[PDB]
Amino acid sequence: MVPMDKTLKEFGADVQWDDYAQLFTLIKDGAYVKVKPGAQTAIVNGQPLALQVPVVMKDNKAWVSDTFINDVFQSGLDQTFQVEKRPHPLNALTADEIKQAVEIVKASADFKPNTRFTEISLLPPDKEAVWAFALENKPVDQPRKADVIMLDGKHIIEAVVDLQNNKLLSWQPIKDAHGMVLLDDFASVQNIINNSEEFAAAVKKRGITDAKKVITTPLTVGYFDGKDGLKQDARLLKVISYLDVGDGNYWAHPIENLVAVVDLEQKKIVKIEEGPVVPVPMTARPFDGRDRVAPAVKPMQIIEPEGKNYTITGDMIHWRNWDFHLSMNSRVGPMISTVTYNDNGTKRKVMYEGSLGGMIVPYGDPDIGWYFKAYLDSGDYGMGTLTSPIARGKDAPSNAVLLNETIADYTGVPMEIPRAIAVFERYAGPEYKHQEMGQPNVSTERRELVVRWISTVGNYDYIFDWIFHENGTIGIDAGATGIEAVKGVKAKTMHDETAKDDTRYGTLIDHNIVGTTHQHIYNFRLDLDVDGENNSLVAMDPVVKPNTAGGPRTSTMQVNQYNIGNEQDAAQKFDPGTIRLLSNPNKENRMGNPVSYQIIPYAGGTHPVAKGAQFAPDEWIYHRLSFMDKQLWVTRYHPGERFPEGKYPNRSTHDTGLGQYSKDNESLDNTDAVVWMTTGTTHVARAEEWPIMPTEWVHTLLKPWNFFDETPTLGALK
Template sequence: MKHILFALLCFVLPAAGSASDNPFAQPSASELRDAIKVMRADSRFPQRARIVAMSLAEPAKRDVYDSTKRATIPREMHCTVFDASSNHTYEFTIDVTSRIVSEVRAIPSAQPMLTKADYDAADSIVRKNPRFVEAIKRRGLNPDSVSVETWASGTPLASTQRILRAIFYVPDASGLNRYDRPIEGLAATISLQSKTVTEWRDREIAPIPRATSTYAIPYERTDVPKVASPSNVRVVDNEVQWGNWRFTPVINAREGLTLYELRFVDSGRVRRVAHRMSLSEMLVPYGDTSGLWAWRNAFDVGEYGFGQNSTQLRKGADVPENAILRSASFADDDGNVVTKPDVLAIYERDAGIAWRHAASATSVASQRGQDLVIQHAAVIGNYDYIISYVLAPDGAITIDVGLTGIMLVKGSVDTTYDGSGSGGQMYAHIVAPNVLAPSHQHFFNFRLDLDIEDTANVVTEVDVWSPPPGDENRFNNAMMLDEWDLRSEREGARDVSLQRARTWRVSSSKLNALGAPTAYTIVPQTVTVPFLGPTALVRQRARFIEHQLYATRYNAQEFYAAGDYPNESDKDHGLPMYQANDDRLIRRDVVLWYTMGVTHVARPEDWPVMPTSHATMKIIPTGFFTRNPLLDSRTAQPPPKKKEKKKSR
């Protein structure tokens, strides 16, 4: 996707160059410059290589949790580089403290995320091809007025080549919508090594749709109420403190918004909830079976990068006026360090009634709810994604993905709905004259390194069920719990069950006042199943969509559900490999990988720009507290006192 915004983001809370004792404080601009300088001076650095992604090399968890070692953890950067001249990928670890390259790894047969240089090269190769010029002129268009939209290959066409695909659009005059006028039937496959178009498809199968007035009404609202700046959010050495919550938010180049060291202060005691939470991988498969569409299967995290495609958040539009906005420093593929404004927002918002009870018509006790939202937005081609972590005072966590932007559409001869479910409308829905939107899915896998109290946790599958009529169910109304501990990694691939209201509880080794382990529970919300067939190649590359939950033993090298390098992969090098050892999970450091998703069947109301839809999940305390923690909040409103009646004389 050519028009995604390339920026390897490193979120900086303090001023650039300032020192931090927080081991997860993201690199400052000066740290990035130092790391790049040290890496390029190393004799092992390929001089023609480009930076693909640079982020903090995360310190070992055991050192972070060891108070005697935490203060002396060195600052290290991890950098993936790609040498196009040799088609080789390398990983560098740079110790910024000692100013040395501490490790270099050559990664065989791996194609990393795409860079701006890849897109520029593909654009140039296509435009110089005489078939492109002829095809565009034959359609009565000026080649200079056509945009070249470049994608990752979508399939492992050749493991030794860096392959891109190109599709074509006629942008509208305003430049606000590059995607509403596809040149259907035209596509190219490009080899960056040979600098050639290796495959050219040219079929005049549909007219180019008319331009759509995407923003026919004013989209800058002036009636948004102003909210006073928050007084309850504090940032101390990169750590955000709000109510009883403590955490460090980071924008990683690949995953985007990541939360580190999520803790809850309970009666003065700091209790661990999660070590790390992030969007690990995405898959967007399209359901159109034509050769021009079947390869459109985007791994938006592993092929393009969420962090490096962050976009600015605007007060009064993307976020409320009371938001704290933070900028980011980043390294581009040429090794330049740039600062990008307002890519992360932190704000309080009203959450409705937190709890309420009316003892009588005039005696009402209640509390107004308030949440903290940590938000980040990325644009991957035509789609806009808004990632939000929502923290509530009662200890609950909501992970929300907002989906908006512009649908990926195809040109068609159809101008109206035909109701036959055949022809061009067999795999797509008409949303405007000559415009079809193919059905597709979005899968979001979140890596949840929950450390409830400590690192010795147990994952339990909890089902609600009803036994058959009998001694256990005399009135045929029984509801019972079936609890089963996940003993090893191969048992850790689990499915949602609506029939059993299935949830997964992560318990610590500590007991609450009632004698039960303190715990948090994963509660599914937005779930879909893949329509890709079991033998579909993309499904073999994205096995994380097979089940909604995977549980694995913690491994500091395992971050991505589809593996480190899904671009042009021939199989899934992620979760299936992570589970291969079948490590024991009982009372171990366990990582959960949860996939939520949506199936998008387009409507005319989704065109020309989509109203935001949402995919969510919840992680809620279960016996973590001794009672409702909101009762300890100062915002609770007790029932009014009864007025004493005056005595009559």
């Protein structure tokens, strides 16, 4: 016998007591439990359950059998989770597979002693075999393989290991590649600064008595063809710094015009750049509420007391007509795979793999601490790795189910991220409605299934939602919050003398604090397979045309329709007044229209939209990262083309991403296509965003276009 409230809260359930009904309600993930003290039975998700030991009330305190949690929550009356008897071949590496793969490479003599890992991931078996698993249950007959990418000092090495046979299949050094930043690089950088008298010197000049209070933040340095005076072949990071004044918000206290360049192979500062002294803003600016009181609000709950409409079977999700596989990657986070829509009995392919491709937050300011600053969060830091556990009921609604996921850390040890992903169903207005005059109304509710993931790199938090609509639409939303990267300036108000120079590149958002203008650019890789792999890309441009049919109208609304046959043409800006379809030319609906999906890389946003990259074309960043300046890309499927910024974007000299994948301008005619959507905002700051930035959203959409023969949510014919 064990104390109920304490044990249940330790287990993650919410416990509610209703004194009028004398009834506990226990909620956790898919389980909604009702139990009265002294009763011999309980209710799990609407279903009766016999108890071995009743709940006993001793002294206004609930006690339960030590076995109650297993008997009630793992009873099988919660159907949310089902056992996976046959593993999906895209399942992520398990903890054991991660450990096995590390032993296999550590067994090589070429494995040097301080070697770190940038990625340990499933090597994807071939597409055709994976589709036949999902659609025909045909076993895949390859062994499980892992990509093991190692960073030996500054050297990158790619290995492949076979996990069934426990052998090493290849070992390829990659000359010229720089590695991504690893967690331990953060501490190194912070120690190197703590141990430089030269740095302490530099900081003393800037008014800082105590150099031990200085917080560093490490940045990749980009590539500028020697013009930043940094040699190409060293492992370098740039270091910006802030003053810890004890408000929990080092970000609010920048030490402007002071940059250290750190060589991580020498573990020393190798350059200090110093510009005008700007006094460090010092006023406490906490964002955690330590100085605040919230208003009392009344409680709101979203409850599903008979359980969920979805089923999670291992990593497979089933919900209404949708089925898909959800797996987690250390670089790009969640990946949605083998997505199909069940059209009256038949599973129809929609998307083979979908995931974040990459993202970049480049800044607009040419000064010493800014000019090179461009966060490539997934590429350079690893957004999977930096997943933020979801705060139950706040980051996601209280009817969510939260999943743990596992990936390798930089030392090769499996790391379990709790609450890495949230899945929840939500009400989203009426699905359709018609109220014919003087007739009974027709309305049905809209339901969306959301898959939500959060990653935090330095000062922003990014939120990605993959949204499945019952009617076949799929949305992808990207939200941004966190703390602005700010410049320390002399101006306190717009009336000060330096105000105008001070704000040339950003808004004054606090006294001495300027929010530097920048962009948020997200790129999604969507290997759509519209009812099969063989697809084509169709444009439909609504046009105003002279009326030629007679009568009083001078004009008409027509559609200009044409195919886009190759990769260079498919790389384009997106006009939200046009329609872009990925069609299957081999298959038609009942009316003879090619089954298609409409691609909408900009379906809206709460911040101003990027039309492309806010950079002149002669900028190195513009040259290295082509993906930034078009909204839409379509390339021929290739298992190894995965990242719009290239595989090794750190200090890269040219575009190894989407600029390379499209170089040879290949045919896109009736073939396996991969769609990439680039969507962006231009962020000009305002005081409302300081000291913490209310979440801002961009939206994208994939809508079925004559994929069905009729309203998909009408339901099956009697």
